[PDB]
Design an enzyme around this catalytic site. Structure first.
Site, PDB file in Angstrom:
ATOM      1  N   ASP A  80      -1.918  18.774   1.626  1.00 31.68           N
ATOM      2  CA  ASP A  80      -3.237  18.333   2.071  1.00 31.68           C
ATOM      3  C   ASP A  80      -3.227  18.036   3.573  1.00 31.68           C
ATOM      4  O   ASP A  80      -2.177  17.996   4.219  1.00 31.68           O
ATOM      5  CB  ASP A  80      -3.696  17.097   1.284  1.00 31.68           C
ATOM      6  CG  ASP A  80      -5.217  16.940   1.253  1.00 31.68           C
ATOM      7  OD1 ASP A  80      -5.939  17.810   1.788  1.00 31.68           O
ATOM      8  OD2 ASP A  80      -5.693  15.940   0.673  1.00 31.68           O
ATOM      9  N   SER A  81      -4.412  17.834   4.129  1.00 32.80           N
ATOM     10  CA  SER A  81      -4.559  17.642   5.559  1.00 32.80           C
ATOM     11  C   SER A  81      -4.344  16.198   6.022  1.00 32.80           C
ATOM     12  O   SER A  81      -4.236  15.958   7.215  1.00 32.80           O
ATOM     13  CB  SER A  81      -5.911  18.189   6.023  1.00 32.80           C
ATOM     14  OG  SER A  81      -6.952  17.798   5.145  1.00 32.80           O
ATOM     15  N   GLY A  82      -4.298  15.248   5.085  1.00 34.34           N
ATOM     16  CA  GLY A  82      -3.887  13.887   5.399  1.00 34.34           C
ATOM     17  C   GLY A  82      -4.992  12.859   5.499  1.00 34.34           C
ATOM     18  O   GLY A  82      -4.744  11.670   5.303  1.00 34.34           O
ATOM     19  N   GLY A  83      -6.210  13.294   5.800  1.00 30.66           N
ATOM     20  CA  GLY A  83      -7.308  12.363   6.002  1.00 30.66           C
ATOM     21  C   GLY A  83      -7.760  11.619   4.758  1.00 30.66           C
ATOM     22  O   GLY A  83      -8.085  10.433   4.841  1.00 30.66           O
ATOM     23  N   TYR A  84      -7.795  12.297   3.611  1.00 29.12           N
ATOM     24  CA  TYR A  84      -8.196  11.643   2.366  1.00 29.12           C
ATOM     25  C   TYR A  84      -7.332  10.421   2.144  1.00 29.12           C
ATOM     26  O   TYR A  84      -7.814   9.332   1.826  1.00 29.12           O
ATOM     27  CB  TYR A  84      -8.041  12.587   1.164  1.00 29.12           C
ATOM     28  CG  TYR A  84      -8.349  11.915  -0.159  1.00 29.12           C
ATOM     29  CD1 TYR A  84      -9.632  11.940  -0.688  1.00 29.12           C
ATOM     30  CD2 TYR A  84      -7.359  11.248  -0.876  1.00 29.12           C
ATOM     31  CE1 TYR A  84      -9.921  11.318  -1.888  1.00 29.12           C
ATOM     32  CE2 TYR A  84      -7.639  10.623  -2.072  1.00 29.12           C
ATOM     33  CZ  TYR A  84      -8.920  10.662  -2.576  1.00 29.12           C
ATOM     34  OH  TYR A  84      -9.201  10.040  -3.773  1.00 29.12           O
ATOM     35  N   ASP A 125     -10.548  17.635   6.845  1.00 25.01           N
ATOM     36  CA  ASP A 125     -11.922  17.337   6.467  1.00 25.01           C
ATOM     37  C   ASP A 125     -12.122  15.842   6.295  1.00 25.01           C
ATOM     38  O   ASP A 125     -11.188  15.048   6.399  1.00 25.01           O
ATOM     39  CB  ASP A 125     -12.267  18.028   5.142  1.00 25.01           C
ATOM     40  CG  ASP A 125     -11.435  17.513   3.971  1.00 25.01           C
ATOM     41  OD1 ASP A 125     -10.263  17.132   4.173  1.00 25.01           O
ATOM     42  OD2 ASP A 125     -11.947  17.513   2.835  1.00 25.01           O
ATOM     43  N   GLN A 172     -17.780  20.380   1.430  1.00 22.23           N
ATOM     44  CA  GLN A 172     -18.253  19.011   1.224  1.00 22.23           C
ATOM     45  C   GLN A 172     -19.756  19.041   0.921  1.00 22.23           C
ATOM     46  O   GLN A 172     -20.282  20.094   0.531  1.00 22.23           O
ATOM     47  CB  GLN A 172     -17.893  18.116   2.417  1.00 22.23           C
ATOM     48  CG  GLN A 172     -16.385  17.989   2.637  1.00 22.23           C
ATOM     49  CD  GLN A 172     -15.702  17.112   1.597  1.00 22.23           C
ATOM     50  OE1 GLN A 172     -16.353  16.360   0.872  1.00 22.23           O
ATOM     51  NE2 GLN A 172     -14.379  17.203   1.524  1.00 22.23           N
ATOM     52  N   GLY A 199     -14.602  16.398  -2.128  1.00 24.57           N
ATOM     53  CA  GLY A 199     -15.609  15.372  -2.306  1.00 24.57           C
ATOM     54  C   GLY A 199     -15.897  15.014  -3.750  1.00 24.57           C
ATOM     55  O   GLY A 199     -16.864  14.305  -4.011  1.00 24.57           O
ATOM     56  N   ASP A 249      -4.795  20.016  -8.825  1.00 26.36           N
ATOM     57  CA  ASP A 249      -3.759  19.020  -8.580  1.00 26.36           C
ATOM     58  C   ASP A 249      -4.276  17.678  -9.110  1.00 26.36           C
ATOM     59  O   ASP A 249      -5.486  17.419  -9.050  1.00 26.36           O
ATOM     60  CB  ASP A 249      -3.501  18.898  -7.078  1.00 26.36           C
ATOM     61  CG  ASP A 249      -4.447  17.928  -6.392  1.00 26.36           C
ATOM     62  OD1 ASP A 249      -5.510  18.332  -5.858  1.00 26.36           O
ATOM     63  OD2 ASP A 249      -4.111  16.729  -6.377  1.00 26.36           O
ATOM     64  N   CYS A 287       4.580  21.102 -28.552  1.00 27.23           N
ATOM     65  CA  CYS A 287       5.149  21.217 -27.213  1.00 27.23           C
ATOM     66  C   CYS A 287       6.556  21.806 -27.201  1.00 27.23           C
ATOM     67  O   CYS A 287       7.407  21.426 -28.004  1.00 27.23           O
ATOM     68  CB  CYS A 287       5.153  19.849 -26.534  1.00 27.23           C
ATOM     69  SG  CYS A 287       5.864  19.846 -24.877  1.00 27.23           S
ATOM     70  N   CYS A 289       8.672  21.678 -24.597  1.00 36.70           N
ATOM     71  CA  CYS A 289       9.498  21.097 -23.540  1.00 36.70           C
ATOM     72  C   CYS A 289      10.828  20.573 -24.080  1.00 36.70           C
ATOM     73  O   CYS A 289      10.981  20.356 -25.285  1.00 36.70           O
ATOM     74  CB  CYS A 289       8.742  20.011 -22.765  1.00 36.70           C
ATOM     75  SG  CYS A 289       8.888  18.321 -23.395  1.00 36.70           S
ATOM     76  N   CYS A 292      10.674  17.298 -26.190  1.00 35.07           N
ATOM     77  CA  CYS A 292      10.151  17.417 -27.547  1.00 35.07           C
ATOM     78  C   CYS A 292      11.083  18.199 -28.470  1.00 35.07           C
ATOM     79  O   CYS A 292      11.023  18.061 -29.691  1.00 35.07           O
ATOM     80  CB  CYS A 292       8.741  18.014 -27.527  1.00 35.07           C
ATOM     81  SG  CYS A 292       7.531  16.902 -26.773  1.00 35.07           S
ATOM     82  N   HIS A 318       7.891  15.588 -19.909  1.00 33.92           N
ATOM     83  CA  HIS A 318       6.987  16.048 -20.946  1.00 33.92           C
ATOM     84  C   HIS A 318       5.565  16.268 -20.416  1.00 33.92           C
ATOM     85  O   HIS A 318       4.939  17.281 -20.728  1.00 33.92           O
ATOM     86  CB  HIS A 318       6.942  15.099 -22.137  1.00 33.92           C
ATOM     87  CG  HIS A 318       5.766  15.358 -23.015  1.00 33.92           C
ATOM     88  ND1 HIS A 318       5.736  16.386 -23.940  1.00 33.92           N
ATOM     89  CD2 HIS A 318       4.537  14.790 -23.033  1.00 33.92           C
ATOM     90  CE1 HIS A 318       4.545  16.404 -24.518  1.00 33.92           C
ATOM     91  NE2 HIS A 318       3.801  15.447 -23.986  1.00 33.92           N
TER      92      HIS A 318
HETATM   93  C1  LIG Z   1      -8.124  11.916  -6.808  1.00 27.75           C
HETATM   94  N1  LIG Z   1      -9.317  12.634  -6.409  1.00 27.75           N
HETATM   95  C2  LIG Z   1      -9.334  13.273  -5.226  1.00 27.75           C
HETATM   96  N2  LIG Z   1      -8.320  13.536  -4.435  1.00 27.75           N
HETATM   97  C3  LIG Z   1      -8.843  14.203  -3.354  1.00 27.75           C
HETATM   98  C4  LIG Z   1      -8.179  14.722  -2.220  1.00 27.75           C
HETATM   99  C5  LIG Z   1      -6.689  14.540  -2.059  1.00 27.75           C
HETATM  100  C6  LIG Z   1      -5.809  15.597  -2.709  1.00 27.75           C
HETATM  101  C7  LIG Z   1      -4.348  15.254  -2.424  1.00 27.75           C
HETATM  102  O1  LIG Z   1      -4.051  14.018  -3.074  1.00 27.75           O
HETATM  103  C8  LIG Z   1      -2.625  13.926  -3.091  1.00 27.75           C
HETATM  104  O2  LIG Z   1      -2.253  13.128  -4.209  1.00 27.75           O
HETATM  105  C9  LIG Z   1      -2.240  11.741  -3.895  1.00 27.75           C
HETATM  106  C10 LIG Z   1      -2.115  15.355  -3.252  1.00 27.75           C
HETATM  107  O3  LIG Z   1      -1.076  15.580  -2.299  1.00 27.75           O
HETATM  108  C11 LIG Z   1      -3.314  16.248  -2.930  1.00 27.75           C
HETATM  109  O4  LIG Z   1      -3.047  17.145  -1.854  1.00 27.75           O
HETATM  110  C12 LIG Z   1      -2.612  18.444  -2.242  1.00 27.75           C
HETATM  111  C13 LIG Z   1      -8.981  15.346  -1.231  1.00 27.75           C
HETATM  112  N3  LIG Z   1      -8.367  15.872  -0.077  1.00 27.75           N
HETATM  113  C14 LIG Z   1      -9.107  16.411   0.846  1.00 27.75           C
HETATM  114  N4  LIG Z   1      -8.564  16.919   1.972  1.00 27.75           N
HETATM  115  N5  LIG Z   1     -10.465  16.511   0.736  1.00 27.75           N
HETATM  116  C15 LIG Z   1     -11.178  16.071  -0.345  1.00 27.75           C
HETATM  117  O5  LIG Z   1     -12.405  16.180  -0.414  1.00 27.75           O
HETATM  118  C16 LIG Z   1     -10.374  15.445  -1.409  1.00 27.75           C
HETATM  119  C17 LIG Z   1     -11.029  14.951  -2.540  1.00 27.75           C
HETATM  120  C18 LIG Z   1     -10.216  14.334  -3.486  1.00 27.75           C
HETATM  121  N6  LIG Z   1     -10.504  13.740  -4.686  1.00 27.75           N
HETATM  122 ZN   LIG Z   2       7.060  17.872 -24.728  1.00 28.87          ZN
END
Ligand SMILES: CNc1nc2c(CC[C@H]3O[C@@H](OC)[C@H](O)[C@@H]3OC)c3nc(N)[nH]c(=O)c3cc2[nH]1
Ligand SMILES: [Zn+2]
Ligand SMILES: CNc1nc2c(CC[C@H]3O[C@@H](OC)[C@H](O)[C@@H]3OC)c3nc(N)[nH]c(=O)c3cc2[nH]1
Ligand SMILES: [Zn+2]
Lengths: 352, 352
Positions: A80-84, A125, A172, A199, A249, A287, A289, A292, A318
């Protein structure tokens, strides 16, 4: 030799699609679940940009040879880009980027992801808070689109990245159809390798999320992968696939695994509950795995109640495996034209 | 078809011996390290009698099919008699047994171990506190010998146990040569399949422990296995083997694994220390374990500093494997007549 990026759709059923993404480091079967890399099969794993940029820092990861070398994973990695995460866990916003207790901008985000060496790079974003007024959702989305262009340009300026990685843009617009459309249009004009629906999974609930997906996913280019960020529970995944999503994810398999919750075809169970203390059945009846195949609910219950790390590890193994079996069943059913029936059968049993 | 119990010595060097114990469920190579069963190769694992008798209870374990079925381990299992743990973790002592917040007696201990289904059953003893006066050590040892006879009789009264399991007696007497001799004589008169040196690793320190082993181990029957309870660090194991010990158990590999400590041929390291943050070497330079084949000190440092359960699991896997490689090197060196040299080389490097 595999291309930098190529998405091919092998079969469709309604809005659902199944196919493959080919990248230099491997093939990703879609619909795909992408587990956390540090969790413990998957075709791609996640790198935790936010954590890594703080400990040990992106420059240090690069010094150590990049994430693939560091984690011992030679297949694709998405970051991810880090901002969330900054907005969720740390802040001061501006047109330049976000400052928090350092400055994270589109340019710096792309550079961090370059230093980590990820294969799928997310645009920088703003994940608009929910609920949002139309005005605030619009202003936020507009800034995200300016940042998407800046992300595009930063990625393209780095030869190794441009030639070997892929860049996804993030739609978004909150829950508003007109803003989702404007966002989709802006992203398509810039041009990306894949498109995420951002979003969502931010407190809106499943009915609303599905309503937004109903109109939002068709706005994205059909011939490119669609990634629903942050989703989700097994039933969320099935419904999102029904609405045209290709990639997922979620923190659930690992968070649940560390907190006594196991996913099964008959719904989630809390293995700590006394009702499992003498249950000789495996976590899930079907399952495949390793857990199991070998151990009972009673033994895993015992381990977790005793505080044994082995218990949490077995639960996590699991849960990750369950998610991958879910995705395999989804792919197979779409390819065989029986996904509608699968979704119906899945829901009837999962919620019985 | 393997016998109920047969110990054979294949080679000797000084007081050190190497050989095999054959039991119905498998062969145990000696000198042996016996890891905690719930930790995560080993020829025998430990069952935690004290924990199991409380949760879920021995009767419940029997209902579930016994420990072998419960844990998914079809090879031998050794269980302690429970009193050490009661006195350490819970008490009222009497000639009958120990009451604590239930009554644990020699008869009840043997029955619990029968219900658990263990292959090597320990006599119910009293681990004398350290330090102890000669009078208190004598009174304690005398009671333990009466309890050893009661343990013998209880074990012999249970057909399935008498025919399929083995019973070890436990020598007491604190640090006193005359009491150790009386205890050894009493145990040999009763007759056991194996003999443990009890009452050590209770705060006396290595020099004193070795001094006691120097005179205590030769008092036990030479043709039977010798088990040093609660030992120990790698250097304790090597020195105990030099003094005629065949079997070991210790909480260290798992406790250390869960607390950032890794065993290496160059001594223990604390992987959380910043000096490992950029160290691309494996945990140990020679170790053949899965962890060392794949991941660096830097990555394991990262995982543990991040609170990831994967980190603790990898540390534990490595530590257990290190202990087993240590035992393999000990067995090979005794069999080849180079154990003295191995012990010297081991110490020089481990403590460098
Ligand atoms: C939970 N709901 C949710 N997560 C979100 C994330 C984080 C995923 C990221 O969260 C990390 O796990 C903690 C994972 O690394 C993943 O990145 C790949 C989002 N990231 C971005 N850039 N933009 C969004 O609009 C966004 C919306 C989300 N809604
Ligand atoms: Zn299992
Ligand atoms: C640490 N030092 C030490 N431990 C000791 C134990 C527990 C081993 C038991 O401890 C459990 O691990 C928590 C293991 O289950 C093991 O049983 C096989 C002892 N047990 C008995 N019956 N008698 C003794 O004299 C004795 C002395 C010890 N010294
Ligand atoms: Zn190792």
């Amino acid at each position: 030799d595999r291309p930098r990026f190529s998405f091919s759709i092998a079969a469709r059923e309604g809005k659902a699609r199944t196919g493959t993404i080919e990248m230099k480091r491997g093939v990703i079967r879609t619909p795909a679940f992408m587990p956390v890399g540090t969790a413990a099969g998957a075709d791609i794993i996640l790198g935790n940009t936010y954590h890594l940029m703080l400990r040990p820092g992106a420059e240090r990861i690069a010094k150590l040879g990049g994430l693939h070398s560091f984690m011992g994973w030679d297949r694709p990695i998405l970051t991810d880009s880090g901002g969330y995460q900054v907005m969720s866990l740390s802040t001061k916003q501006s047109e330049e980027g976000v400052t928090f207790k350092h400055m994270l901008s589109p340019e710096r985000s792309i550079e961090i992801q370059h230093l980590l060496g990820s294969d799928i790079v997310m645009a920088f974003d703003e994940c608009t808070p929910y609920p949002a007024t139309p005005s605030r959702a619009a202003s936020s989305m507009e800034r995200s689109m300016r940042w998407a262009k800046r992300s595009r340009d930063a990625f393209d300026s780095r030869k190794e990245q441009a030639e070997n990685a892929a860049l996804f843009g993030i739609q978004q617009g909150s829950v508003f159809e007109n803003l989702r459309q404007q966002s989709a249009d802006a992203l398509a004009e810039i041009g990306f390798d894949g498109y995420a629906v951002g979003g969502l999974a931010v407190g809106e609930g499943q009915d609303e999320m599905f309503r937004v997906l109903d109109f939002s996913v068709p706005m994205l280019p059909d011939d490119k992968p669609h990634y629903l960020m942050g989703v989700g529970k097994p039933d969320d995944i099935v419904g999102a696939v029904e609405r045209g999503i290709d990639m997922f994810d979620c923190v659930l398999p690992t968070r649940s695994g560390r907190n006594g919750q196991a996913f099964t075809w008959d719904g989630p169970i809390n293995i700590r509950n006394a009702r499992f203390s003498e249950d000789l059945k495996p976590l899930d009846s079907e399952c495949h795995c390793a857990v199991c195949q070998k151990w009972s609910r009673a033994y895993i219950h015992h381990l977790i109640r005793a505080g044994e790390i082995l218990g949490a590890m077995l639960m996590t193994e699991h849960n990750i495996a369950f998610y991958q079996q879910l995705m395999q069943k989804i792919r197979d059913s779409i390819s065989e034209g029986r996904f509608s029936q699968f979704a119906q059968d899945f829901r009837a049993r999962y919620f019985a």
